[PDB]
Design a protein around this ligand. Structure first.
Ligand SMILES: Cc1n[nH]cc1CNc1ccccc1F
Length: 168
């Protein structure tokens, strides 16, 4: 059994841990929590084989700059989630894009453009925009909702294959 190290990053108000809770025990959290660093591991059957889903959470505080670029010496799976409820988060993705690209020292890397809060009527980011950026980033776009559980597992199963594609 291999442990798939996946790191979820993004802006504040996207609800990163919300997707995790939805994927672990199948539940949508309403209350927001300022998570600094939480550990989430679960054995799931991916591609037929039992794999260990290692999900590490990150803080939304831009004050820990010396922590963001500290142990990020290694990285197998990156998760860039954005919310269509806020256009700033969509633009903030560009900052993380170059940030990670610079730290990774590479361009090609298994990634997925996932959008949360897609069921919210506060659509500030249209679908065309996401597809446009996805084409430039070179990664697929997957609309996901934690409130209605809109294909959550499908957004993970894809990334796992991408990693295996990059490796073999
Ligand atoms: C911290 C730490 N304590 N024990 C091992 C590690 C490294 N793990 C890890 C590092 C970066 C992204 C994702 C990860 F799971």
């Amino acid at each position: 059994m291999t442990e798939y190290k996946l790191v979820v990053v993004g802006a504040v108000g996207v609800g990163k841990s919300a997707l995790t809770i939805q994927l672990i025990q199948n539940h949508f959290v309403d209350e927001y929590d300022p998570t600094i660093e939480d550990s989430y591991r679960k054995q799931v059957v991916i591609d037929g084989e039992t794999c260990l889903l290692d999900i590490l959470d990150t803080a939304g505080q831009e004050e820990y700059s010396a922590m963001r670029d500290q142990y990020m010496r290694t990285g197998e799976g990156f998760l860039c989630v954005f919310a269509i409820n806020n256009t700033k988060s969509f633009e903030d993705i560009h900052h993380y894009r170059e940030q990670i690209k610079r730290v990774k020292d590479s361009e090609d890397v298994p990634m997925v453009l996932v959008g949360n809060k897609s069921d919210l009527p506060s659509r500030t980011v249209d679908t065309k925009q996401a597809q446009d950026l996805a084409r430039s980033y070179g990664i697929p776009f997957i609309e996901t909702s934690a409130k209605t559980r809109q294909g959550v597992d499908d957004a993970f199963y894809t990334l796992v294959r991408e990693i295996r594609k990059h490796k073999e």
